[PDB]
Write a protein that binds this ligand. Structure first.
Ligand SMILES: NC(=O)c1ccc[n+]([C@@H]2O[C@H](COP(=O)([O-])OP(=O)(O)OC[C@H]3O[C@@H](n4cnc5c(N)ncnc54)[C@H](OP(=O)(O)O)[C@@H]3O)[C@@H](O)[C@H]2O)c1
Ligand SMILES: NC(=O)c1ccc[n+]([C@@H]2O[C@H](COP(=O)([O-])OP(=O)(O)OC[C@H]3O[C@@H](n4cnc5c(N)ncnc54)[C@H](OP(=O)(O)O)[C@@H]3O)[C@@H](O)[C@H]2O)c1
Ligand SMILES: NC(=O)c1ccc[n+]([C@@H]2O[C@H](COP(=O)([O-])OP(=O)(O)OC[C@H]3O[C@@H](n4cnc5c(N)ncnc54)[C@H](OP(=O)(O)O)[C@@H]3O)[C@@H](O)[C@H]2O)c1
Ligand SMILES: NC(=O)c1ccc[n+]([C@@H]2O[C@H](COP(=O)([O-])OP(=O)(O)OC[C@H]3O[C@@H](n4cnc5c(N)ncnc54)[C@H](OP(=O)(O)O)[C@@H]3O)[C@@H](O)[C@H]2O)c1
Ligand SMILES: Nc1nc2c(ncn2[C@@H]2O[C@H](COP(=O)(O)OP(=O)(O)O[C@H]3O[C@@H](C(F)(F)F)[C@@H](O)[C@@H](O)[C@@H]3O)[C@@H](O)[C@H]2O)c(=O)[nH]1
Ligand SMILES: Nc1nc2c(ncn2[C@@H]2O[C@H](COP(=O)(O)OP(=O)(O)O[C@H]3O[C@@H](C(F)(F)F)[C@@H](O)[C@@H](O)[C@@H]3O)[C@@H](O)[C@H]2O)c(=O)[nH]1
Ligand SMILES: Nc1nc2c(ncn2[C@@H]2O[C@H](COP(=O)(O)OP(=O)(O)O[C@H]3O[C@@H](C(F)(F)F)[C@@H](O)[C@@H](O)[C@@H]3O)[C@@H](O)[C@H]2O)c(=O)[nH]1
Ligand SMILES: Nc1nc2c(ncn2[C@@H]2O[C@H](COP(=O)(O)OP(=O)(O)O[C@H]3O[C@@H](C(F)(F)F)[C@@H](O)[C@@H](O)[C@@H]3O)[C@@H](O)[C@H]2O)c(=O)[nH]1
Ligand SMILES: Nc1nc2c(ncn2[C@@H]2O[C@H](COP(=O)(O)OP(=O)(O)O)[C@@H](O)[C@H]2O)c(=O)[nH]1
Ligand SMILES: Nc1nc2c(ncn2[C@@H]2O[C@H](COP(=O)(O)OP(=O)(O)O)[C@@H](O)[C@H]2O)c(=O)[nH]1
Ligand SMILES: Nc1nc2c(ncn2[C@@H]2O[C@H](COP(=O)(O)OP(=O)(O)O)[C@@H](O)[C@H]2O)c(=O)[nH]1
Ligand SMILES: Nc1nc2c(ncn2[C@@H]2O[C@H](COP(=O)(O)OP(=O)(O)O)[C@@H](O)[C@H]2O)c(=O)[nH]1
Lengths: 355, 351, 351, 351
């Protein structure tokens, strides 16, 4: 049964980057934390296995995991009915934009309709007035940005099947809030990174590749659009904002961002500086290369296979509303983020060159 | 010289008028029809070459479903259309609250399945694609009237699914140079409109009352306001949007607003009865002034959890670029629908 | 005790007869109806309390779909049935080859969704569940005649989907002690049979030929042999299966076999014509002895890629345990269908 | 000629051994990999041309999912494989009871999606298709031993989904003349086996106990009896089936039966411990004879609602027609698995 003082979180996507930090953040506050984990042929729990009570035996304590999938309605109802959460964080998703162009229907089913399935499970279980629901929305919703900077009232313009699926999810969450008075909020989070970031997102790809070059495991790597500009924060700061949004007296949507913009090119330059290399760019378009000023070796090339058919050229978030209402502020700035990711990947690649 | 149209949703209101419109222009018209335990082709069976033997001529029908990717690829490969009109949908807003996932799968993901089939079949640079978008996208309207630059604010699972479809069509246009357009059509009605949409519900019920086959019927929100046009005028806009030199999205509307209550009042005037209202909210009833008899009541079961209170479309862009303009105005629409349902109900009291 | 039935597929042939059968026994009958752009309730509209107003009495209808889990849970939680008859299906074998995935989703996974909805609602010990299984499971028959223990060998995507449904029903029975049964029904027909199944296609076409509305029609495999009963007899067997003390699977059939050719011959005799066959394979035609006119041809588009040549059911187990026996035999079934279709086609040549 | 394999499920146990096998035979090997938030390629990363940079040579990987029809068509159309091995599946029986619908969509309908992609792509005449069928199809075994003609009786949602897949493969073979075969493989294990299948759970746990990193572990049904072979031997059989001149289904098994209890006993013997059993049912424990410590308990949460008590395969047909025989017998299998897991746990106590 529900009672005041019992805090029970259900996290979809607990094995991902954000889920892993959010689980840690909520455990520290004394929550019982439940997560939904996909069945996989090998365990996919590497980011959260340190949160077992006994990590050698994989015995659970205050973090409890359940097999499920956002495409299986019955499994979501069974889990929610057993857990009776006070807070639900829907972080599960096919979260990669480039992959969404080749997996557009799967991305729609998980990222769009899966949000509806989870909301519908809350309603089926009779929990509409018992649970607070956080939806992981995204600055990708702004796509071809209609305003600079982007805030909660900037109109959406998605540019991928991922963005379209997340737009459905955004509005179905609003509809449950308005139709049924579910406390449900959209966190419109701008890009956020960490050493736990998926390896094929651009920041982690750069930090991994720079680490491999530093260690002699790699000579060169390829990127797509060097001129893309992004607002990059640290995932550990942003999961705190997710929790603050469910602590708010009223269910409101918020932009969470740093408000500071950098290019992919700058992320590359700063990463290489951390291994003592100055990158000099030469050429243009798909023939642009990044050369080490000291040695003259080409370390970065461009490959059109990494371009997106409809690029998101520029993102910059204005989080004034969150600063005023939630008293949220980012604590990690861009330069520290880059150093932390390169440093962590150098250590990772030293231990395991196949990592 | 080749004009081959493929219409999903050909059995519905709009598909039936669009089929007639394209046949009149000499198109070969193909339609996708759902398997049904009884035939669902009543609106188009007059377009068979031999309607007694159900033998096809220039309108050809194919079993399929917007939730079955393989069947869509198979049909598009066989037909090789030059124009595709995606009119198929679970199109009812109230039903979408109880069938939210089905509505997402057909109206949202089904649009992606059809676009993906176009791409799979190698047609991305030859076919022109029309998406049936909707004024329901404006939902809780952010401007009056609503135009192409008015932000969307959907208010039902139908609206949210159609918003996904709107943007996935834009993405296929922008990513792959598909000639694909969104028709943002405001409400449009006809004697072929589904019986549980408000206008046809009213005209059917008023017809039955005129013929003494019914005494009373119940509605939901009487003060909802809508921009109502005639479906036969609007399918022409769909075709015009694919004739345009460049693929653009357009609002199609009359720009004139009336309430459900006004549709009731005008419908009853056509059968010689003046409705006067008494009471409030779910206790409001509509009584014939001349006889004192109650003919209209309100039932909360017909309300929607999140209502769309007001729609009024501004189709300036379509007027200027497509030269489209509506022909049937509200008063004629009501008269036409009441007259047609009187003729139908005369033939069959159970209709 | 409470007698509340939930019928999926209530608008179909069997659902319409089962609803009548259960209403006569005093049940409250609930059905799940697909949203459709025209109403699909023609077989059951006479069961409204007021058929002119479409007001429900003891038969109550709910919009839903076997591919929407949430909707199924909502309906089962509202209705709390004591008996569930899962008759809803894409039931056409030929169309299943073009709609294989949709047929799997509705006929196979939909049965699982309904069973899971029962379990989700906490009714696993409180409901009896009937699954509409089919002689198509025997496909390439491994025994003649076929009984409950005959090994299955399906021959179409419909057969495969129904076989999944058969085994998931058995698994719910064995794993969770659900009172769930498979009715393995052989072909059953009626004047309400879908028009594109072979028996109704023949009876409709013979009627149209009698009335001068049609000259000729085409069939597929004339040599297919079937065990054909009357749907009205067979819905009684479904009910008897849920009255049984223990959940058991049963074959329901006549045990008598006739060819499609024979059904054609007997149907034409009821309009006073003796059909005489000439030619072979795709060139075979049936000609009226009295007039010399060709009335039947063969068209390969009606062949199935993997035919089911022969079905003959052995219903000894049901005769012994349920005291079930069919009341309508083949000759009376034919007469009834031809007679009903002449009446229908006289009233409407486009029917 | 051209030898290009497409392996779904390449990241799994069998896919990793099959990829190795086909690369050694000179094939270009393509694999479909699911998007995952961390890479799921641990079993095959040594097959990159440069494993430090994850650069591909003769093994090429493609993102996809068996539930996404468009992605399968794109991959198959790009690869143009000569052989397709459908190993991708939710392959865990206990998990299938909680994930019944997902298991149906991937293991059942996903097989149809892959077959339909072959057909869509025009490859029906140029590809050989292997389906990963399973002795779980026999479930409550209807013959002992089980062979190709033994009737199936599945006992889980996994079994039911794989039964759908088996018959849809047969139907593509018979309807469209696709060279498509069902490998009916009995249980096969290796040091790459998923950690929550019973053999690998035992070997992992015995290794952790040996190294003092675990005290005890729990099992479900100790008395279940299985036919266990080595995955490395069995992937050769898959390839042999597609080398056959005619498409036939084959049982692949050892024909030797052992219990879970015996697997436990033999595993502990390899670390120098004699397990002795005391108690009954869920209170049964396995105790070290030497030290008196309890190392094995029983937990009903690992029981399946409908167990498969006994499997024993008869692979006479494969021995005659394929000249296949297993190289690894049960005793060596146990030894290899415990030794491998000891070596793993020495490197990483959290493994
Ligand atoms: N990081 C950003 O910059 C950012 C910005 C805004 C919004 N977002 C959104 O925020 C959320 C978390 O981001 P992230 O960076 O943590 O993404 P991530 O690392 O890619 O984690 C995705 C999670 O979702 C799970 N998942 C995927 N498909 C699923 C399914 N069908 N059913 C259930 N679970 C499934 C994954 O499981 P596996 O481990 O099994 O793959 C993983 O746990 C996502 O919804 C993402 O779209 C991210
Ligand atoms: N009328 C309006 O005021 C209005 C306004 C803007 C946009 N729209 C959109 O315009 C389009 C047509 O409107 P309408 O009034 O003609 O709607 P309609 O009469 O309800 O017709 C709906 C059509 O879609 C078909 N359909 C439904 N589910 C399907 C599925 N799963 N697969 C394939 N076909 C399916 C229906 O087939 P059955 O006959 O088998 O049910 C019917 O042919 C719809 O997309 C509607 O949402 C309508
Ligand atoms: N008649 C036989 O000889 C025979 C023999 C053995 C087994 N069966 C099985 O017995 C059952 C009834 O047979 P029938 O002859 O009555 O079939 P039918 O006339 O084709 O009726 C099929 C019913 O299922 C409904 N339905 C179809 N797809 C649906 C979906 N996605 N969600 C919900 N409902 C859906 C149809 O609704 P619409 O009206 O909207 O299409 C109709 O009510 C079927 O399962 C059939 O496969 C028939
Ligand atoms: N081993 C046996 O004893 C045995 C006996 C007979 C038959 N089988 C069948 O043989 C095949 C392989 O067995 P295994 O032991 O190698 O199983 P496994 O280790 O569990 O591998 C399962 C594979 O399928 C992939 N997969 C899961 N869901 C998928 C999806 N939705 N789309 C695409 N790929 C997906 C998995 O990817 P992730 O790595 O991303 O999870 C993995 O590559 C399976 O079909 C299994 O059912 C096994
Ligand atoms: N541990 C690990 N790391 C990998 C793997 N593949 C790539 N990377 C690292 O990922 C980062 C970005 O590389 P990318 O090419 O931008 O990533 P993609 O995900 O787009 O493509 C990768 O897909 C793989 C998949 F199997 F998923 F299809 C393979 O095809 C691989 O060759 C390809 O690079 C870099 O740091 C890589 O080292 C892998 O299997 N295991
Ligand atoms: N021919 C016909 N007309 C019908 C039928 N049901 C309603 N109407 C007419 O439709 C108009 C609107 O009535 P509504 O109540 O607003 O329509 P809904 O679709 O919301 O609800 C209807 O659903 C039916 C369904 F079976 F689909 F669930 C039944 O439950 C029916 O009782 C209910 O009215 C009016 O003019 C009606 O005459 C029917 O079966 N056959
Ligand atoms: N009332 C009505 N009857 C029809 C219709 N089409 C066929 N029949 C009658 O059905 C019987 C069987 O004919 P079939 O050709 O064996 O039926 P199919 O379902 O295989 O094919 C039919 O499909 C239709 C569909 F639209 F669904 F795709 C059209 O293509 C139609 O031309 C074709 O006959 C006969 O008695 C017919 O008179 C129709 O639209 N309305
Ligand atoms: N490396 C690793 N090994 C694990 C993990 N969990 C279990 N094991 C090992 O698996 C073997 C079998 O254990 P089981 O309990 O029979 O396995 P299940 O898959 O049924 O259940 C497991 O599910 C997990 C999941 F997150 F997936 F839900 C967690 O709940 C975990 O506590 C539970 O054991 C043993 O050798 C374990 O060491 C893990 O996260 N990482
Ligand atoms: N993932 C990825 N992104 C790249 C690459 N090269 C440039 N980018 C750009 O980097 C930006 C951020 O991409 P990503 O990290 O995947 O996050 P996104 O904002 O969700 O698309 C996008 O504009 C990409 O187009 C590359 O090799 N991989
Ligand atoms: N369908 C329907 N709508 C009603 C009824 N009573 C009032 N309305 C209102 O009429 C308006 C138009 O409804 P509808 O014809 O279904 O078309 P919509 O604009 O797409 O929702 C909506 O605001 C409804 O809430 C009723 O009985 N049925
Ligand atoms: N539906 C249909 N079946 C035909 C036709 N001609 C021959 N048949 C055969 O009649 C038999 C019964 O078919 P049908 O009535 O559809 O029921 P089924 O037994 O479920 O396939 C099958 O063997 C068909 O192949 C035809 O024109 N239509
Ligand atoms: N996975 C698993 N199986 C167990 C356990 N204890 C007993 N078994 C039995 O071991 C047998 C083989 O199980 P498994 O390795 O998962 O493969 P399966 O034959 O496909 O079910 C089954 O009869 C299980 O019930 C356990 O803890 N885990």
């Amino acid at each position: 049964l529900y009672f005041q003082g019992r805090n029970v979180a259900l996290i979809t996507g607990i094995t991902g980057q954000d889920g892993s930090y959010l689980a840690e953040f909520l455990l520290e506050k004394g929550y019982e934390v439940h997560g939904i984990v996909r069945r996989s042929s090998s365990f996919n729990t590497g980011r959260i296995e340190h949160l077992y009570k006994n990590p050698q035996a994989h015995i659970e304590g205050n973090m409890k995991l359940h097999y499920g999938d956002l495409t299986d309605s019955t499994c979501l109802v069974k889990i929610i009915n057993e857990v009776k959460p006070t807070e639900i964080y829907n972080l599960g998703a096919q979260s990669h934009v480039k992959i969404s162009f080749d997996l557009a229907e799967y991305t729609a089913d998980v990222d769009g309709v899966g949000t509806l399935r989870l909301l519908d499970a809350v309603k089926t279980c009779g929990l509409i007035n018992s649970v607070k629901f956080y939806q992981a929305s995204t600055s990708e919703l702004y796509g071809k940005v209609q305003e600079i900077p982007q805030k909660e009232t900037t109109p959406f313009y998605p540019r991928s099947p991922y963005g379209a699926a997340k737009l459905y999810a955004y509005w179905i969450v609003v509809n449950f809030r308005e139709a049924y008075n579910l406390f449900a909020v959209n966190g419109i989070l701008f890009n956020h990174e960490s050493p736990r970031r998926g390896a094929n997102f651009v920041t982690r790809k750069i930090s991994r590749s720079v680490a491999k070059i530093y260690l002699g495991q790699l000579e060169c790597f390829s990127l797509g659009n060097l001129d893309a500009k992004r607002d990059w924060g640290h995932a550990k700061d942003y999961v705190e904002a997710m929790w603050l949004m469910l602590q708010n007296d009223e269910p409101e949507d918020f932009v969470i961002a740093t408000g500071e913009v950098h290019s992919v090119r700058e992320f590359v330059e700063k990463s290489f500086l951390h291994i003592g290399k100055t990158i000099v760019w030469e050429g243009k378009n798909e023939n642009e290369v990044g050369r080490c000023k000291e040695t003259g070796k080409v370390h970065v090339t461009v490959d059109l296979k990494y371009y997106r058919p409809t690029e998101v050229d520029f993102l910059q978030g204005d989080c004034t509303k969150a600063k005023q209402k939630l008293n949220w502020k980012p604590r990690v700035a861009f330069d520290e983020l880059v150093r932390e990711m390169v440093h962590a990947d150098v250590e990772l690649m030293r231990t395991n060159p196949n990592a």
